[PDB]
């Protein structure tokens, strides 16, 4: 609540300022992972999806790491189910690291998709 | 051989102030006693921050000035921005070799940002003379006392603006080949500002 | 033998005719000259080779003035250098008479520069084949320029050329980097001597005579002067210090 | 410097050939389709003005030049060669007939001048001919309506209708049948459009085609919006909009 | 073909050795330039190749100020670029002296085009390998880009690109101009146009650029000015802090 909110803003601003499109100190992958789980607890699933899409257009820290944050996120929505399943569609179409080639180890890309397919089939 | 001859307003000046130079003129061409021109542009740009006042024969000053304009355009593009002293020499060269046909009384006044404002006065026959301020034409002797005594360096723009408007408006009254508009040109680093005041204005003010 | 080696009345498939390329190659097997830009001046130095005891010390000079405040030294083919300078003079004087001022270094550079380009667009008029390090001080600072065979010139902050170029450039960049640009004009004289002394290590089957000059705004008072007397002894002292001695 | 190539750079052989010229004649063929029709009811010229890059505009490219207010010219070949020869052609037309004789030049006599320049740059050593062929179309009361070709050779001839550049042989042929002695200027604009349609497609629209006519004119641009001293010049070049509109009714 | 290097004769090909190689050699300085026009501005951005620490980074130029309005970028070897620059500067001033009117882009293009054609015709001068991109915001012609290429051919352009990576840049300009349905930039403030330009340039050439890797010349109605190091930085700064 109040905790999630302070923590999320602080780690987010600093990661963007250090990492940039070119390093000044950067932020490790751990820093962005922390930020991700903070923002999922904080605010709604549609807002998480939107904020993640917007970051990833910069360059990320690398395209691979972006796929790792998707993969986590997908699992979490599938735990909760119902309307949360609807949002799963939403992450996938918006972020082009998992709907288009941006890199050539994209095993995580095929895997996310198969998770979505399985649900759709239900 | 030129048939008839022409004359200009013969009380011209460049005055240094706080941040540069303010250049001041009366303008009037007559051809005899026919008033060829009420107003004139004889407030001549020879470069973007370096203007001049032209006096003497209209035909001759304009013909020279055009040549000076060509050299100082070419001069800028190649050898870097001029100086007031650079412009002044070019004007002089053209007068001196052809002082057999030319009558040009020139004040070239320009602003540089490491010399501040500069006045170089080139009389008839042509010689470069650096002064901190100038008055020229033939009406200048009569205001020599005023000009020397009230000339002050680093005077407020408002105060210099009054001083030039007044300086000329007195000169124009007592002298007879003077007349028409008073036009003034402020040269600082912010650019070039143009003033025109008509007869009915300046006489009064 | 293609008419891209016997004529310059055409453009080449390499964008330059072979003979101009060859001028660049002949500067480098030559004699060493440097130029050091500093925050208030420029310093020039050239290595004068000693081949006999029949030569006289400093009664043959390679650094020649243009005007009174621009100093010119060049490396490469001797005749071509005389002709370049003679021209350099005619421009300089024409400028002083005509505008009533000593000539700017970016201006002076455009005038020599256009003339080196001219002799490189005709099929029977010889190219130049000297690289000229030149410069001086004017009313908005000090400037160091270097002119090439091909008509190529840019402003430099350090410049080096010749046999011992590699060595020279190494020491020279270290010192320039270390300094704001080159520190004082005075410090730069000694430094300059070390580079020339260091370059001489690349050719010990001959002797040298160190020759320095300078042109500095407040440390020559706008003039170009030869560096001599005490100031030459001191730069020698510094040089023989580091390169052991 | 000069004085190294003072032998001519055309020479003969027993086949009588002039090296430079044969090569230059080839260049004309490799130009774009330009044509001329004299309809004996005016003169109509059309050519293609075409891009050479996707961000090149064609409304900064013309192949139709005015030589004088009432003599127009069109070409195929080298672009540069045409502009430089055109400057010199302009020079003589203006200084030597409009000041000396006070009037516009007669076409055939201007045909003699332009030829003489081209033949001259071949006769003199150290320089080559121009690698173009021009069609000079003009009108005068005295001569009627007229059309000549001047070759890269500096030879000339008159031609009732002709075409030069790519697709020369077929374009002239189709035209010869469609050419009547007594031919209406609107039909003669269609035939020109029709021909250029056969040379090019997939980039053929009316705003990339530049057509100019000798006959109809606008007095309102010749300073005779008011009371005339006379009617004045007969050449008037179409804008794109006029061309496109007619292309729809082709 | 012909044998253009030994005598000034034609080729049956129509294009000569002097022309053909002038088309090629115009890049060996590892340079790329583009010019776009705004609604009411014209911007040039050009690579700046300072390859050493023996040279001052702001004496290396490739953008010349020919007139007070007119700018010219020369894409070619530097002696040829200065040979063209010297001639262009005189013709620009001479035209103002005689005809009382400063030089526009198209008339300078024409003069030089005619000269280049003559030196190809001559056997007593060489032609140069220069592509001259002339730019301004002319008083009657609006915003202008007119580019000449060697041959003595010249034509007017929407926008243009030069350098080996011409093709990469082109696809980005095309995509914008179709989308917007006009052949100029909708924007009208030279800052936002400069910023846009750089964006499409980073994307095409694939490296993020510094101020010392760029050199900017801006044309506006009645003035031409070059942007300094700080000035370039201010634009760059925004492109680094948005996605």
């Amino acid at each position: 609540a109040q905790n999630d909110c302070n923590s999320a803003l602080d780690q987010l601003l600093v990661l963007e300022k250090k990492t940039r499109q070119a390093s000044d100190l950067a932020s490790s992958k751990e820093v962005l992972a922390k930020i991700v789980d903070l923002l999922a607890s904080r605010n709604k699933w549609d807002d998480l999806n939107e904020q993640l899409t917007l970051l990833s257009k910069k360059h990320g820290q690398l395209k691979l790491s972006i796929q790792y944050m998707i993969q986590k996120v997908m699992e979490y929505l599938k735990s909760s189910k119902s309307l949360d399943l609807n949002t799963r569609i939403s992450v996938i179409e918006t972020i082009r690291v998992v709907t288009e080639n941006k890199i050539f180890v994209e095993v995580e890309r095929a895997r996310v998709t198969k998770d979505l397919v399985e649900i759709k089939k239900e | 051989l030129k048939k008839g001859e022409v004359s200009l307003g013969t009380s011209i000046m460049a005055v240094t102030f706080k941040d540069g130079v303010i250049l001041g003129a009366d303008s009037r061409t007559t051809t005899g006693a026919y008033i060829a021109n009420r107003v004139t542009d004889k407030l001549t740009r020879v470069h973007d921050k370096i203007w001049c006042c032209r006096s003497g024969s209209a035909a001759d000053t304009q013909a020279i000035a055009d040549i000076v304009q060509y050299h100082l355009e070419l001069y800028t593009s190649q050898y870097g921005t001029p100086s007031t002293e650079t412009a002044a020499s070019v004007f002089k060269e053209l007068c001196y070799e052809n002082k057999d046909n030319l009558t040009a009384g020139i004040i070239v006044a320009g602003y540089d940002d490491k010399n501040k404002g500069e006045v170089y006065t080139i009389p008839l026959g042509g010689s470069v003379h650096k002064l901190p301020y100038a008055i020229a034409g033939s009406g200048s002797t009569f205001i020599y006392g005023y000009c020397d005594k009230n000339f002050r360096e680093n005077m407020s723009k408002e105060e210099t603006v009054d001083f030039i408007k007044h300086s000329l408006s007195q000169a124009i009254k007592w002298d007879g080949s003077s007349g028409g508009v008073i036009r003034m040109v402020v040269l600082t680093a912010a650019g070039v500002e143009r003033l025109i005041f008509y007869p009915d204005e300046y006489e009064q003010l | 033998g293609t008419g891209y080696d016997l004529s310059n009345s055409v453009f080449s498939p390499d964008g330059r005719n072979f003979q101009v390329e060859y001028a660049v190659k002949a500067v480098e097997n030559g004699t060493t000259s440097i130029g050091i830009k500093c925050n208030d001046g420029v310093v020039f130095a050239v290595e004068k080779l000693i081949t006999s005891k029949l030569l006289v010390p400093q009664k043959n000079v390679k650094i020649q003035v243009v005007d009174r405040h621009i100093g010119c030294v060049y490396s490469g083919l001797i005749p071509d250098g005389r002709h370049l300078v003679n021209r350099g003079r005619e421009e300089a004087a024409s400028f002083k008479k005509l505008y009533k001022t000593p000539i700017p270094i970016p201006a002076f550079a455009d005038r020599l520069g256009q003339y080196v380009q001219a002799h490189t667009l005709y099929n029977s008029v010889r190219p130049f084949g000297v690289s000229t390090i030149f410069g001086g001080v004017d009313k908005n600072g000090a400037h160091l320029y270097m002119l090439e065979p091909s008509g190529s010139y840019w402003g430099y902050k350090g410049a080096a050329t010749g046999k011992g170029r590699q060595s020279a450039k190494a020491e020279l960049e270290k010192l320039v980097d270390h300094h704001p640009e080159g520190l004082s004009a005075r410090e730069a004289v000694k430094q300059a001597a070390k580079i020339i002394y260091l370059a001489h290590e690349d050719n010990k089957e001959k002797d040298f005579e160190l020759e320095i000059s300078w042109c500095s705004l407040s440390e020559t008072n706008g003039l170009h002067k030869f560096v001599k007397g005490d100031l030459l002894q001191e730069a020698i002292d510094f040089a023989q210090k580091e390169i052991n001695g | 410097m000069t004085d190294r190539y003072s032998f001519s750079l055309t020479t003969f052989s027993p086949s009588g050939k002039l090296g430079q010229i044969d090569y230059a004649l080839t260049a004309v063929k490799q130009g774009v389709t330009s044509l001329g029709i004299k309809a004996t009811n005016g003169v109509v010229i059309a050519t293609e003005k075409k891009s050479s890059s996707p961000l090149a505009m064609s409304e900064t490219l013309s192949k139709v030049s005015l030589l004088t207010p009432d003599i127009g010219a069109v070409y195929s070949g080298m672009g540069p060669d045409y502009r430089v020869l055109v400057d010199k052609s302009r020079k003589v037309a203006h200084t030597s007939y409009k000041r000396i004789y006070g009037e516009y030049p007669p076409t055939k006599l201007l045909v003699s001048e332009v030829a003489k320049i081209m033949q001259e740059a071949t006769q003199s050593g150290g320089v080559r001919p121009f690698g173009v062929s021009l069609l000079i179309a003009g009108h005068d009361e005295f001569n009627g309506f007229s059309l000549y070709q001047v070759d890269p050779s500096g030879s000339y001839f008159p031609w009732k209708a002709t075409a030069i550049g790519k697709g020369s042989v077929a374009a002239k042929t189709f035209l010869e049948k469609r050419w009547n002695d007594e031919l209406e200027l609107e039909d003669a604009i269609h035939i020109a459009l029709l021909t250029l349609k056969e040379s090019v497609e997939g980039e053929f629209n009316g705003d990339t085609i530049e057509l100019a006519i000798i006959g109809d004119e606008n007095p309102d641009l010749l300073g005779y919006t008011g009371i005339p001293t006379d009617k004045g010049p007969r050449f008037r070049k179409l804008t794109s909009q006029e061309i496109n509109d007619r292309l729809e009714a082709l | 073909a012909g044998y253009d290097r030994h005598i000034t004769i034609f080729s049956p090909e129509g294009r000569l050795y002097q022309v053909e190689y002038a088309f090629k050699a115009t890049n060996q300085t590892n340079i790329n330039s583009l010019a776009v026009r705004g609604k009411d501005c014209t911007v040039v951005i050009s690579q700046k190749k300072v390859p050493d620490k023996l040279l001052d980074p702001t004496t290396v130029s490739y953008i010349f100020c020919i007139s007070r309005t007119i700018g010219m970028v020369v894409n070619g070897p530097i002696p040829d670029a200065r040979n063209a620059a010297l001639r262009a500067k005189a013709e620009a001033a001479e035209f103002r002296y005689k005809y009382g009117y400063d030089m526009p882009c198209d008339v300078l293009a024409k003069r030089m085009a005619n000269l280049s054609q003559i030196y190809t015709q001559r056997a007593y001068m060489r032609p140069l390998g220069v592509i001259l991109t002339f730019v301004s915001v002319d008083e009657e012609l609006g915003p202008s880009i007119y580019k000449t290429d060697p041959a003595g051919y010249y034509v007017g352009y929407k926008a243009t690109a030069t350098g080996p990576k011409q093709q990469e840049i082109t696809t980005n300009l095309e995509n914008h101009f179709k989308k917007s349905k006009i052949d100029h930039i909708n924007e009208e403030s030279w800052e936002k146009v400069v910023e846009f330009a750089i964006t499409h340039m980073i994307d095409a050439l694939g490296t993020e650029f510094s101020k010392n890797d760029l050199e900017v010349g801006v044309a506006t109605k009645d003035k031409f000015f070059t942007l300094s190091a700080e000035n370039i930085e201010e634009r760059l700064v925004a492109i680094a802090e948005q996605d």
Side-chain angles (χ1 to χ4, degrees):
Chain A
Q2 291 177 334
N3 287 342
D4 288 346
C5 290
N6 287 339
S7 65
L9 291 173
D10 289 346
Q11 293 298 308
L12 178 61
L13 292 173
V14 173
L15 188 161
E16 290 177 350
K17 290 179 180 178
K18 290 179 181 178
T19 299
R20 302 183 177 188
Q21 295 179 308
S23 67
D24 189 57
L25 295 174
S27 298
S28 68
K29 290 180 179 178
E30 182 178 1
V31 173
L32 182 60
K34 181 178 179 180
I35 292 168
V36 172
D37 289 345
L38 290 172
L39 292 174
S41 294
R42 181 177 177 181
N43 63 55
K44 294 181 180 180
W45 287 112
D46 289 346
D47 288 346
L48 178 62
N49 184 37
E50 182 179 1
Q51 291 177 334
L52 291 173
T53 299
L54 292 173
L55 292 173
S56 68
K57 290 180 179 178
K58 181 175 72 174
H59 184 72
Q61 295 179 38
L62 180 65
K63 292 295 184 182
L64 291 173
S65 294
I66 292 168
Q67 290 175 358
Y68 290 139
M69 295 300 97
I70 292 168
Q71 184 65 54
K72 288 173 67 176
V73 173
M74 290 298 292
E75 290 177 16
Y76 290 139
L77 292 173
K78 183 175 180 180
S79 294
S80 294
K81 296 182 181 179
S82 191
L83 292 173
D84 289 319
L85 291 173
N86 287 340
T87 299
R88 290 178 67 194
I89 292 168
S90 294
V91 171
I92 297 300
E93 291 179 351
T94 59
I95 299 170
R96 301 293 294 170
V97 301
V98 297
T99 59
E100 183 177 332
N101 186 282
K102 300 296 183 180
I103 191 166
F104 296 105
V105 180
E106 56 180 329
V107 72
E108 292 297 311
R109 180 177 177 181
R111 289 177 180 171
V112 171
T113 298
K114 70 183 183 291
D115 288 345
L116 182 59
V117 171
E118 290 177 350
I119 297 300
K120 289 179 181 178
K121 182 177 179 180
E122 290 177 350
Chain B
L1 184 66
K2 294 181 177 67
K3 182 179 179 181
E5 63 184 355
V6 298
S7 180
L8 301 175
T10 316
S11 180
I12 61 172
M13 64 186 69
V15 179
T16 61
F17 63 92
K18 182 177 184 294
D19 294 321
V21 64
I22 299 171
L23 178 66
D26 64 16
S27 64
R28 183 178 181 271
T29 300
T30 185
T31 301
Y34 292 86
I35 300 171
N37 295 279
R38 181 182 64 79
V39 299
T40 65
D41 182 353
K42 300 295 182 184
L43 281 64
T44 300
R45 186 173 69 186
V46 299
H47 191 280
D48 288 346
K49 295 181 179 179
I50 301 172
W51 296 59
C52 63
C53 298
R54 292 179 293 107
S55 180
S57 176
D60 289 346
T61 59
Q62 184 65 55
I64 292 168
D66 288 345
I67 293 169
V68 172
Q69 290 176 333
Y70 180 78
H71 289 297
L72 295 175
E73 291 297 308
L74 181 60
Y75 178 79
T76 298
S77 66
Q78 294 178 352
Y79 299 124
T81 301
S83 65
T84 298
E85 184 176 2
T86 299
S89 65
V90 173
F91 286 113
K92 181 178 183 293
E93 182 178 1
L94 291 173
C95 290
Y96 181 78
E97 292 179 351
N98 292 285
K99 68 188 288 188
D100 62 358
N101 291 337
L102 300 175
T103 301
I106 299 170
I107 300 171
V108 178
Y111 179 76
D112 196 26
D113 62 353
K114 61 175 185 292
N115 294 288
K116 300 184 184 177
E118 296 290 339
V119 179
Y120 299 85
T121 300
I122 302 172
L124 295 175
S127 179
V128 176
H129 300 282
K130 182 176 175 65
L131 297 172
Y133 63 93
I135 60 172
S138 65
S140 66
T141 298
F142 290 105
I143 61 170
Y144 182 77
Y146 178 79
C147 290
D148 289 346
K149 183 175 180 180
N150 292 288
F151 182 78
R152 184 177 178 183
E153 296 181 348
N154 195 28
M155 181 181 286
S156 296
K157 181 178 179 180
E158 182 179 1
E159 291 178 350
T160 299
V161 173
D162 289 346
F163 181 79
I164 293 169
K165 289 179 181 178
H166 184 255
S167 179
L168 292 173
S169 66
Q170 293 298 308
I172 292 168
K173 181 178 179 180
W174 289 105
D175 291 315
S177 64
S178 65
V181 298
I182 299 170
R183 296 182 180 184
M184 299 177 284
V185 180
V186 178
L187 301 176
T188 66
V192 178
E193 182 178 356
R194 181 177 179 181
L195 300 175
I196 301 172
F197 298 87
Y198 291 100
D200 289 345
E201 291 178 351
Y202 74 90
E203 181 179 1
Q204 184 65 55
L205 301 177
Chain C
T2 60
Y4 297 117
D5 190 28
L6 297 175
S7 180
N8 292 337
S9 62
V10 299
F11 181 80
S12 65
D14 294 321
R16 65 183 183 185
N17 292 311
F18 286 145
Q19 293 298 12
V20 173
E21 183 176 62
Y22 291 156
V24 171
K25 290 180 180 178
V27 172
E28 291 179 357
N29 291 333
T31 61
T32 298
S33 64
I34 62 171
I36 300 171
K37 184 177 179 180
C38 301
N39 289 312
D40 63 359
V42 297
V43 178
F44 296 86
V46 64
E47 182 179 352
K48 181 171 70 174
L49 297 176
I50 299 170
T51 62
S52 67
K53 295 181 179 180
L54 298 177
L55 296 175
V56 61
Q58 296 290 293
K59 300 296 183 182
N60 295 294
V61 298
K62 295 180 179 180
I63 298 169
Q64 298 287 332
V65 299
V66 178
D67 295 326
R68 62 179 172 93
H69 60 97
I70 300 171
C72 299
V73 63
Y74 65 93
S75 296
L77 297 176
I78 292 168
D80 288 345
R82 289 181 183 276
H83 184 70
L84 178 62
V85 173
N86 186 63
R87 298 289 78 77
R89 289 176 180 170
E90 290 177 350
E91 291 297 308
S94 294
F95 178 100
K96 290 179 180 178
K97 182 177 179 180
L98 293 173
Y99 297 103
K100 299 182 175 65
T101 183
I103 189 167
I105 297 300
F108 181 79
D110 288 345
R111 289 177 180 171
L112 292 173
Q114 188 276 330
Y115 289 138
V116 173
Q117 290 177 1
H119 293 291
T120 59
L121 297 174
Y122 298 68
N123 65 7
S124 62
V125 178
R126 181 179 174 87
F128 292 110
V130 297
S131 176
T132 300
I133 299 170
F134 62 92
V137 298
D138 62 20
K139 293 181 180 179
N140 65 22
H143 299 276
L144 177 65
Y145 298 91
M146 182 175 179
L147 178 66
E148 297 181 355
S150 65
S152 294
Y153 62 93
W154 299 84
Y156 296 87
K157 295 180 73 174
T161 188
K163 183 175 180 180
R165 183 181 296 159
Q166 290 175 343
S167 294
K169 181 174 72 175
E171 182 66 19
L172 178 61
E173 182 177 1
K174 181 178 179 180
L175 290 172
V176 171
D177 289 346
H178 182 71
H179 294 167
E181 183 177 1
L183 298 175
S184 67
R186 181 184 64 78
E187 290 177 292
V189 171
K190 289 179 181 178
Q191 290 175 58
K194 182 177 179 180
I195 292 168
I196 298 301
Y197 178 22
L198 181 60
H200 185 256
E201 291 179 323
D202 292 334
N203 185 343
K204 296 182 179 179
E205 296 180 356
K206 296 182 181 182
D207 291 341
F208 64 92
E209 182 177 297
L210 180 66
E211 182 177 300
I212 188 166
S213 67
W214 60 3
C215 182
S216 178
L217 178 61
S218 61
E219 298 296 299
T220 60
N221 196 28
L223 301 177
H224 186 74
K225 296 182 181 181
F226 289 77
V227 178
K228 64 182 178 179
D230 289 346
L231 291 173
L232 182 59
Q233 184 65 54
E234 290 177 350
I236 292 168
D237 289 346
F238 181 79
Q240 67 184 314
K241 182 176 180 180
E242 293 296 310
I243 300 171
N244 290 341
Chain D
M1 293 178 70
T2 62
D3 294 332
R4 296 292 181 271
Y5 301 102
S6 64
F7 289 101
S8 176
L9 298 176
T10 60
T11 64
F12 293 86
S13 66
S15 65
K17 293 182 180 179
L18 300 175
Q20 290 176 333
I21 293 169
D22 289 346
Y23 287 149
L25 292 174
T26 299
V28 171
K29 290 180 179 178
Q30 299 299 304
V32 299
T33 300
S34 64
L35 58 78
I37 300 171
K38 178 176 71 74
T40 316
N41 193 34
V43 179
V44 178
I45 298 170
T47 191
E48 183 179 13
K49 62 180 180 180
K50 184 177 180 182
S51 68
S52 62
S53 180
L55 297 175
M57 294 180 71
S58 65
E59 298 296 340
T60 58
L61 178 66
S62 179
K63 294 179 178 64
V64 177
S65 63
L66 297 176
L67 296 176
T68 66
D70 64 357
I71 300 171
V74 65
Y75 63 94
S76 178
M78 294 180 72
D81 288 346
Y82 180 78
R83 290 186 185 95
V84 173
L85 182 59
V86 171
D87 289 346
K88 289 179 181 178
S89 294
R90 289 177 180 171
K91 180 64 167 63
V92 173
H94 294 81
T95 298
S96 297
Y97 299 105
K98 295 181 179 179
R99 182 179 64 80
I100 294 169
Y101 296 98
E103 298 290 339
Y104 289 114
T107 298
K108 68 183 181 182
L109 293 174
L110 182 60
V111 171
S112 294
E113 182 65 20
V114 171
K116 183 175 180 180
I117 292 168
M118 291 176 71
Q119 187 276 329
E120 182 177 1
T122 299
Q123 184 65 55
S124 177
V127 298
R128 66 179 180 87
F130 291 93
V132 298
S133 178
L134 290 78
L135 300 175
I136 300 171
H139 189 47
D140 196 293
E141 290 177 350
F142 287 112
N143 294 317
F145 292 91
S146 66
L147 179 66
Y148 298 91
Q149 182 177 7
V150 178
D151 291 341
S153 66
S155 296
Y156 66 92
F157 299 88
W159 296 74
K160 289 179 181 178
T162 190
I164 61 172
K166 183 177 181 181
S168 179
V169 172
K172 289 176 69 69
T173 298
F174 286 144
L175 182 59
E176 183 176 335
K177 181 176 175 64
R178 294 174 295 170
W179 182 93
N180 294 312
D181 289 346
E182 295 180 357
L183 178 66
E184 183 179 347
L185 291 173
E186 291 296 338
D187 289 345
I189 292 168
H190 289 297
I191 292 168
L193 291 173
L194 179 60
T195 298
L196 292 174
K197 182 177 179 180
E198 293 179 356
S199 66
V200 178
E201 64 183 23
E203 62 182 7
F204 183 76
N205 64 69
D207 294 321
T208 59
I209 303 297
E210 182 178 61
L211 184 154
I213 62 172
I214 301 172
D216 289 348
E217 52 83 60
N218 184 344
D220 289 319
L221 298 176
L222 298 176
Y224 300 117
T225 299
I227 297 170
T229 299
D230 61 32
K231 182 177 179 180
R234 303 297 301 277
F235 182 101
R236 184 178 178 184
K237 182 170 72 175
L238 296 175
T239 64
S240 294
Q241 184 65 54
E242 290 177 292
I243 293 168
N244 186 63
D245 288 346
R246 293 179 178 89
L247 182 60
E248 293 179 356
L250 181 63
Chain E
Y3 297 89
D4 293 334
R5 68 177 186 271
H6 298 291
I7 61 172
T8 300
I9 62 171
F10 291 96
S11 297
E13 292 180 357
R15 186 175 67 192
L16 302 176
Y17 287 119
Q18 290 175 304
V19 173
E20 291 177 322
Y21 291 124
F23 285 144
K24 182 177 179 180
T26 60
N27 186 274
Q28 293 178 332
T29 61
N30 296 308
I31 187 166
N32 295 279
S33 299
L34 60 82
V36 299
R37 295 181 293 170
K39 182 177 179 180
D40 63 5
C41 64
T42 301
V43 177
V44 178
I45 299 171
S46 178
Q47 292 181 348
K48 180 172 68 174
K49 179 71 172 68
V50 179
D52 204 356
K53 301 295 185 184
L54 297 176
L55 283 67
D56 186 293
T58 59
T59 61
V60 177
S61 65
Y62 297 103
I63 299 170
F64 296 86
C65 182
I66 301 301
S67 190
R68 295 175 293 171
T69 61
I70 302 300
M72 181 178 73
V73 178
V74 178
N75 295 302
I78 296 299
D80 289 345
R82 178 65 181 85
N83 186 270
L86 178 62
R87 181 63 178 166
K89 289 179 181 178
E91 290 177 350
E94 290 176 351
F95 181 79
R96 184 176 182 275
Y97 180 78
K98 183 175 180 180
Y99 297 103
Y101 181 52
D102 191 81
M103 183 65 73
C105 291
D106 191 61
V107 173
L108 181 60
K110 181 67 175 177
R111 180 64 178 168
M112 292 304 295
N114 287 340
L115 290 172
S116 294
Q117 187 276 329
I118 292 168
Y119 291 156
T120 60
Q121 184 177 328
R122 294 178 69 185
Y124 298 103
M125 185 62 68
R126 65 174 299 272
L128 302 176
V130 298
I131 299 170
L132 300 175
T133 300
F134 293 86
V135 297
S136 68
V137 181
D138 188 82
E139 291 178 322
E140 296 179 55
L141 298 177
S144 298
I145 301 172
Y146 298 87
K147 182 178 180 182
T148 63
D149 64 21
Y153 180 76
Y154 62 93
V155 178
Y157 298 91
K158 289 179 181 178
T160 188
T162 185
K165 295 182 180 180
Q166 181 180 357
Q167 290 175 331
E168 291 177 323
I169 292 168
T170 298
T171 59
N172 287 339
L173 292 173
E174 181 179 1
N175 287 340
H176 180 73
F177 287 142
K178 290 179 180 178
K179 181 178 179 180
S180 68
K181 301 183 182 177
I182 61 172
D183 63 353
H184 62 272
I185 297 170
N186 186 63
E187 182 67 54
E188 62 182 7
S189 176
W190 66 268
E191 290 176 350
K192 290 179 180 178
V193 173
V194 173
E195 182 179 1
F196 178 79
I198 293 169
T199 299
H200 290 196
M201 185 175 176
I202 292 168
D203 289 346
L205 297 176
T207 300
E208 185 178 2
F209 296 108
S210 68
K211 290 191 291 293
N212 290 333
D213 295 335
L214 301 175
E215 183 177 81
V216 178
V218 178
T220 66
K221 185 178 180 180
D222 296 322
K223 186 176 182 180
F224 181 79
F225 64 92
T226 298
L227 299 176
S228 69
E230 290 177 350
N231 287 339
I232 292 168
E233 182 177 1
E234 188 277 335
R235 290 284 83 192
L236 291 173
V237 171
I239 293 169
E241 296 181 357
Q242 298 181 317
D243 60 328

